[PDB]
Symmetry: C3
Subunit: 326 residues, 3 copies
Amino acid sequence: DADKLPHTKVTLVAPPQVHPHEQATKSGPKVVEFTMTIEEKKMVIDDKGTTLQAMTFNGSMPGPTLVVHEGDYVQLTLVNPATNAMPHNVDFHGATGALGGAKLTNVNPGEQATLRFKADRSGTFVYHCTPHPFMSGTLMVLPRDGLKDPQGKPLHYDRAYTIGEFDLYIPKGPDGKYKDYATLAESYGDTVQVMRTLTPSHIVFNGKVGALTGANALTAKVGETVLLIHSQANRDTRPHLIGGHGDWVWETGKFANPPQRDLETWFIRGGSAGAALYTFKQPGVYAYLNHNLIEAFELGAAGHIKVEGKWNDDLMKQIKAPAPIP
Amino acid sequence: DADKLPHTKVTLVAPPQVHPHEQATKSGPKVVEFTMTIEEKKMVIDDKGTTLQAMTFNGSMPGPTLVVHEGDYVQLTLVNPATNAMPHNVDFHGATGALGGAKLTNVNPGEQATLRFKADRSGTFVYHCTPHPFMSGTLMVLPRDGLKDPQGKPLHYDRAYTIGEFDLYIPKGPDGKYKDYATLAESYGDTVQVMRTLTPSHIVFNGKVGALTGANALTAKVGETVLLIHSQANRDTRPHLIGGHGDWVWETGKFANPPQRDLETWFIRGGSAGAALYTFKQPGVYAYLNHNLIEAFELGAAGHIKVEGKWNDDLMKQIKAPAPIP
Amino acid sequence: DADKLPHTKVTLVAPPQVHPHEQATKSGPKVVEFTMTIEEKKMVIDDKGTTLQAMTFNGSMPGPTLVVHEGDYVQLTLVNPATNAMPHNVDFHGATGALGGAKLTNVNPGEQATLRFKADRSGTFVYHCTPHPFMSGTLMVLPRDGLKDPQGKPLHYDRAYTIGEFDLYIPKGPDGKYKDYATLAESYGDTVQVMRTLTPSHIVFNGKVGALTGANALTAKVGETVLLIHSQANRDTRPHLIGGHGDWVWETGKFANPPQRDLETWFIRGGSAGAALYTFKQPGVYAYLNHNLIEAFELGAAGHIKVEGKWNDDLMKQIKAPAPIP
Ligand SMILES: [Zn+2]
Ligand SMILES: [Zn+2]
Ligand SMILES: [Zn+2]
Ligand SMILES: [Zn+2]
Ligand SMILES: [Zn+2]
Ligand SMILES: [Zn+2]
Ligand SMILES: [Zn+2]
Ligand SMILES: [Zn+2]
Ligand SMILES: [Zn+2]
């Protein structure tokens, strides 16, 4: 029985980080306790001041990544302060029954509720508010013994990074400029019309064109293995590490399945999270992007990863530098 | 030789049902005989009276699902009554040679023809009229010994359901309202222009926004295993069972391949059929949908499954009901 | 060490052909030397004279396919004559570090450079100019022992064919006709606006609506096994052999992974190359196409394969020819 089990309380962190956690664990089924605070707000989403009338779990797009193990129970306290304007809920793709929890978690402003479900299937899993993919994140459910390659050999990551990718549908006034709305409710009707064209005005990693560039680049060092968790609650995307690979990729994001190796580009189905391991072998700046290069370069779906360490001439070498043609 | 074999005659049924059939079978290679009647007609496809100038196999979108076993031969009598206006044919993705049969089956109004081909590859397979994905269905070819999991362990379904998903491209007049055409031939030119924008006006399960909702919901009981066969002859879709999973999914729909487990969302390539098993564990209403939530909610790609049985507190429990914040 | 190894010089050929090469090889790690000449030019891309302001490796879309083995080193001399107008580079998805080589290969008109990298991961891999998917091709890296099926059984192809698929975004003037630009630089601004709609004006195999039809059809004979290499540096496509199958398909295009069998339609992620084997069993004309039939028929993503040999009545037979209804 679940009630008769130990309870742990987890402190969540902002994306792109994932809270500290154990991979392989001698430990036993726990009930893991999480709390999240829904937050409506306006956000600047590009370099030119365009705003989005947003809804978030915990203030961030994406919401934070919750981590448990196969067999653990997730118990989430979902809070929706009075400072907000709408009901909300949460649908956990990792959970079974009641529209993934959506039905047991409808909370008006100033309300709260608490859900428990068995996390009995390993993998990365999207949770989102039932009709809003803008409010989403990843539930990572690790197998009790850690990640395994197709032959059962152990696998691991030294650091985890979390990337939620968002297709945005921002309306334009008669002048051709993006509309700014005073409330969430007023954005609604125009946004739907733009959504019906199926053409995003913007596709952003982590809230904003550039969220994962400049001072905000991800980081690693040569010899380090990194887990890239990629979620997209609404639209297909195709992650690619420029100059890298996915050493082992669960593109459908479910750990009881063997991963694929050596991927150049993988595929995240809209309504899901997937996961890729890469061990760095060269230093420098990498681009992690959506390999529709229009969606990446023109619309916003690209980030960087600054990698420290020693250059390897065996893997790659500049034989003749750029020079005039003989 | 095929001629020297026993012949069976199968009675087809309307979607979402699949005609009664054997899974694992001690039986031997049969020649299975099917007949289909092509039918052009106008259809109401949404809640507001929008019509589509349609073509169907057997009166329904999708056409009925034909079921055989690996090694069986499909022999189809394709009929096109005089009451119709165009030639038609059938391309079976399950068949080898002659454009999947398209070349041996061109039938003008008042004509008919009969095709046989070896069904020598297991899987769910799309058949459609050569230039019209609107006229399509699934050929399920079962392995002679039934469905197998990745380790060879036997698998099964207690009931099969069939979902054909259709991207529709309905033209608008200068006033902004959907055009109504008196014939199939007059819809053609405007529809092509809208098709060239690659933006469906509608994406429907089984003919109509709502075909699989209300009184028409699919049905199951807790402890039952259901096969969800999903076909899309023209455009990519991404099925998801809200509150459920795909326990075992052949997303490319070919049974000699190991299935994947625990999928939250799977992917059907345009021009194919895939297949998912789910064993229910909770009662209530589920939504089976295209997890581009614009395509589902705004455009029409969503259905329901009403599930009877006993609630399970272990899997999911409401710990604190929605209540004011302390 | 790489410098201490034998060097081979390979002569490249125009698509759809792939230069002669060994599959399984008793031979040892070589350093393979390739040279490519970048070429800007205007091209006619459809039947009605529409032009594209193009950039190519070696004069062709796609660029030629480079073939090596796992363990070999690729050393490419990249040349950009003075007759051109822009810098260019190359990003090899098969390579590790320095943005796949892009950083070590920026070459202005009249410059050249030479890159070496270890090809240490088997598979088909896209190489392209960093911001232009129009300039792309495939690096096929074969496993040293040849293609293997999921059980380790040997596989082979008798001939290889190469298909690069290109989504084109051609601007229209106020009259509704495609714009013709005098330089590459003048096409830029209008093209970007059209790209931002994410709606190709054209999707072409190998440079041109029809490049792989009529006298230019691919060819085979019954009993022959063919490798279809399919690359798409920018957008998702879904190859399908009408009347055929993918006997063994590495849709993510990476050979250390087991292939899937019996596929009706496969999926190439934008930013990747995949690969399918088919052994012909029937003669006639086949269509190899993108199974979004709008993208194929209306936009240009379809080709033919003329197959010689003996008709097989076991696989497929016309039982009753088209005839009046009794
Ligand atoms: Zn909400
Ligand atoms: Zn490590
Ligand atoms: Zn969902
Ligand atoms: Zn037809
Ligand atoms: Zn059962
Ligand atoms: Zn087809
Ligand atoms: Zn370039
Ligand atoms: Zn051969
Ligand atoms: Zn690339």
